[PDB]
Each structure stands twice: as C-alpha cells, then as structure tokens.
Swiss-Prot record, chain A:
Modified residues (Phosphoserine): S280
UniProt lineage: Eukaryota, Fungi, Dikarya, Ascomycota, Saccharomycotina
Encoding gene, per UniProt annotation: RTT107
Positions spanned in the full protein: 2 to 484 of 1070
Other noteworthy facts: Present with 1380 molecules/cell in log phase SD medium.
Protein name: Regulator of Ty1 transposition protein 107
Function: Required for resumption of chromosome replication after DNA damage, specifically in S phase. Is recruited to chromatin in the presence of RTT109 and RTT101 in response to stalled replication forks and acts as a scaffold during DNA repair.
Subunit structure: Forms a complex with the cullin-RING ligase (CRL) RTT101(MMS1-MMS22). Interacts with MMS22 and RTT101. Interacts with histone H2A; requires H2A to be phosphorylated (gamma-H2A). Interacts with RAD55.
PTM section of the record: Phosphorylated by MEC1.
TM regions (residue ranges): none
Signal peptide extent: none
BRCT domain residues: 1-102, 116-191, 236-328, 345-429
Compartments reported by the entry: Nucleus
UniProtKB/Swiss-Prot annotation, chain B:
Whole-protein residues included: 13 to 39 of 464
Name of the protein in question: DNA repair protein KRE29
Subunit record text: Component of the Smc5-Smc6 complex which consists of KRE29, MMS21, NSE1, NSE3, NSE4, NSE5, SMC5 and SMC6. Interacts with NSE5.
Purpose: Acts in a DNA repair pathway for removal of UV-induced DNA damage that is distinct from classical nucleotide excision repair and in repair of ionizing radiation damage. Functions in homologous recombination repair of DNA double strand breaks and in recovery of stalled replication forks.
Location of the protein in the cell: Nucleus; Cytoplasm
Length: 460, 22
C-alpha cells in the first residue's frame, strides 16, 4: 500500500553490519512507498571513522544541506551520535518506528523507540507537580527525566504513568483522590544507578502517607540514593569530566537539602569541586579564600550574588545546573558560549500565560523538550492539543492538520491566533525582547531546507 | 474545538500551574 504519511521528511538509515542490509532495504521501501522526500543509507561498517572528527560541520556537509528529520538506527554506537542527538536534536529511532508508524498511520512519539540503553524511562509519561517544588527543583527533575528518555506532561491523563511529588502534604495528592505517585528519588535512582528500580528500593520511592515528618523523607533518600556501585558503567566513561574545575553554587538554588547532596556527589564523582554560597557570605573573602573557583552555577541571571561575583571574577564561567548535565551528555567540558541558550542563568520572565499559551506541531523527541523548556523560561505555557485557548502555533513547515486549522483561524481579525516559527521564541529570549512574530524571518516555514535552522542552534 | 496531538487530558495544565516559591 501507499500513502503520503512521510511527505516532506528526510531520513538517514545507519547500517551497523552487512547482515542488516535486508532490514535496511525493507525500511527504505516502507519510507518510499509512503512518500518520504529522501532516504539516505550510510554503512558504518564500510568506512574508517578512526581519527576523523565526525563533528557538527562534518555531519551537515556529509548529509545535508537540508535537515535530517529522523535517523534510523538500532544502536547508538557510532561516533556522531552525540552531535545528532544532543546538539542538533535529531531523533534516533529503531527500525520498528517506521513499521509501527506505517501501521498506525501516524508519526509516533520517538521516545519509546530510542536505542540508547540509558533511556530507562522511555516508556513513562511523567507529571511533575509544580505545587510540590521550587522552580529550580522542577527544572532539574525535568532535565534528568529528559536525559533518561522519558516524556514530560503538564496535565494528568489516562496516558500518564507517574506523578512526582515531594511529600504527602502536597496539595496535588488530596485534590485528585492507572498511575503511580512517587518521590523524585524514583527519577534520581535511574539516573545514578542506570538500571531499573526493582528491589525493595522500589518500594521506598512511592508516596507513603505516614511520611509526615521531614526526618523520614531524609531517611528514604539516604537509603535509595545514599550509598553506590552502578550498572552500565560503559555508557558515560569519562570520570574526570570536571577535573581541575571548582563550582560555586548560588544560594538562589534552594534545593531540598538531600537534593543538593545529590548534585554535590554528581559533581564530585566526576572529579570536580563544590563550594556552596550563602546569602550572608562576604563574597570577596570567599573567592579569595578559594582562588581556584572558576565556575558559578545559579538559577537566575539577575541574582545580586551573580552581579557581585562577575565584578570580582569577571572571567568566571557562568552557567546553570542544566549546563552541568549537558556537559555530562557531551562527555566534554564546554564553555557556556558554545552551549545553548538554556544553559545560562535564566532571564526574568518575558511574557505571561495570557500573552503566551502556545501549541506546536511536527516537533519530535528532544525538539519537543526544547520548545517546552523555552516557553517555560519565557514565562508561558505550552499545550499538547491545539484549541482556541492558544495564542500561538509554533511550526517548522506547512504540513499537518494542526497547521491548516491554525492557519485558517489566523485570518480572522477577531481570533488572531498567530502562526510563527521557533526562531521567534529563540530570538525573543536571546534579545530579551517581545519581538513581532509576523516579521519576515519568523514567517519562514521552510526551515527544513537548511539544517542550521534546527531549533536550538540560535545562540550557539 | 480540540485538535489532538497526533503522535486526552482530564486535569488541566492551568490548575496546578504555580511553583511553591512563586
């Protein structure tokens, strides 16, 4: 049979061994029979990639100039995986994604089909209760969830598998009462140990109404993630990532104290050093007493602590916690200016929910995580469904009913929902300015013709 | 009305929208 399901999409199949040619041919045929724009094949086993820098420029020149939408691979063991997956945000999906997507006649979510064996929560649809957490806690839990391949939802549904809460006192528990209520150690365990949560340990992580005292929570945390030896030791082998670096941790990161211990152990197990700053510290003397401090880690770009810090140490690296975890995924220390806009201390909110309640289409996998992060730090909301509650539709291209409906509603002078591309979101944040989404550059819905227009490149 | 994801919510996003340090 045939269809237009994959219309205007470019694919790249990585063949890891000659025995996989029949399934490579069988997948190209499904993609062509359903009207894909282009499907390149690349044989990993038939080229020497030793001592050639398979970097971002190498990849764009070798397989562009237009975007690749999906890389099809049943392994992540190839030397441009990190460039594809963490920088360019191109999904990497198994052969089965093509089969299932054809059978269901829809572009399925990429997460369950990732072959990264670290993506231990690829199945989970996770609600994180904002009422339960500070901003900086929420951002860290989302970072690690995304790094574990899970999906973040901002609504409870039948699809939802997990609800992350801090304590029985949290108001989300009561007002609700299938899916399971757990403490954030459910996330952190998978991250630290890289194996599923199955023992009696798995029982500790579930919401327990007897835990009305702080002393009990502290005690489950020290048990579940306190004390070590982990699985899949080969997956992040650079145990000196932060050697000769020393991080000053801002007091505007008011973490649950065991959560700070986790971040300190993560840093220190990667051979870095950590000093916590407090609000009453004299900063000149802290930095003079610890002159090897070369990085500041903070939540807000407008912290007074960060202003005085820059004055004392004007060459300090200035990052956020997200920045640490991105260095973790690249497995290389990397200056903030070479990372992404989301790896800086956050700007003050630009928009309100009322100005900015956006919906989006054709963004898979990490690009999805990225629009969501961007909307958050811009001050708005994002929804999975397009309704009339929405102020904008963000789009890359012109396909999908979602675009057609929203492009129709934008012709009405009363409605006035706006259709714009993602660079409006990005340039707004970078310039810290409410730019105009009907500008020429933000009406370009042919971004796929160039890979440099991939969401997340602006600010690099 | 509602155009689905294409890749149904009961408790909406705007209800529990605040962080405990807002």
């Amino acid at each position: 049979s045939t269809s237009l399901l994959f219309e205007q999409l470019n694919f790249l199949i990585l063949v890891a061994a000659e025995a996989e040619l029949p399934i490579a041919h069988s997948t190209r045929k499904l993609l062509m029979d359903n009207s894909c724009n282009n499907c390149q094949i690349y044989e990993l086993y038939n080229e020497n990639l030793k001592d050639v820098k398979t970097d971002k420029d190498w990849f764009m020149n070798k397989f562009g100039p237009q975007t690749v939408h999906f890389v099809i691979s049943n392994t992540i063991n190839f030397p441009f995986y990190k460039i594809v997956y963490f920088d360019l945000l191109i999904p990497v999906v198994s052969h089965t994604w093509v089969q299932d997507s054809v059978k269901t006649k829809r572009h399925l979510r990429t997460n369950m089909y990732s072959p990264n064996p670290f993506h231990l929560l690829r199945d989970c649809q996770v609600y994180i209760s904002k009422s339960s957490f500070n901003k900086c806690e929420y951002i860290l839990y989302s970072d690690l969830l995304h790094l574990l391949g899970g999906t973040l939802v901002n609504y409870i549904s039948n699809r939802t598998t997990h609800v992350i809460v801090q304590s029985p006192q949290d108001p989300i528990i009561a007002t609700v009462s299938e899916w399971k209520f757990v403490y954030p150690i459910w996330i952190l365990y998978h991250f630290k140990m890289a194996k599923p949560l199955k023992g009696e340990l798995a029982t500790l992580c579930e919401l327990d109404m007897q835990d009305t005292s702080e002393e009990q929570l502290f005690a489950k945390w020290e048990e579940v993630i306190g004390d070590t030896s982990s699985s899949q030791l080969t997956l992040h082998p650079n145990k000196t990532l932060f050697k000769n670096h020393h991080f000053a941790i801002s007091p505007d990161l008011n973490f649950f104290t065991p959560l700070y211990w986790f971040l300190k152990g993560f840093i220190e197990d990667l051979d870095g050093k950590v000093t916590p700053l407090s609000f009453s510290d004299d900063l000149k003397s802290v930095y003079q007493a610890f002159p090897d401090i070369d990085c500041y880690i903070g939540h807000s770009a407008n912290s007074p602590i960060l202003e005085k810090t820059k004055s004392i140490k004007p060459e300090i690296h200035v990052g956020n916690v997200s920045w640490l975890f991105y260095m973790f995924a690249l497995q290389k220390f990397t200056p903030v200016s070479q990372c992404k806009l989301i790896h800086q201390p956050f700007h003050a909110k630009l928009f309100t929910s009322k100005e900015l309640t956006v919906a989006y289409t054709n963004y898979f996998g990490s690009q999805r995580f990225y629009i969501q992060r961007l909307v958050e730090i811009l001050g708005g909301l994002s929804t999975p469904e397009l309704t009339r509650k929405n102020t904008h539709l963000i789009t890359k291209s012109t396909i999908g009913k979602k675009f057609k409906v929203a492009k129709k509603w934008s012709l009405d002078p009363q409605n006035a929902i706006i259709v714009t591309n993602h660079m409006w979101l990005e340039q707004c944040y970078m310039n810290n300015s409410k730019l105009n989404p009907k500008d020429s550059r933000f009406q370009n819905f042919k971004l796929d013709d160039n890979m440099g227009w991939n969401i997340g490149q602006i600010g690099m | 009305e509602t155009v689905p994801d294409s890749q149904s919510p009961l408790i909406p996003t705007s209800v529990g929208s605040y962080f405990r340090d807002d």
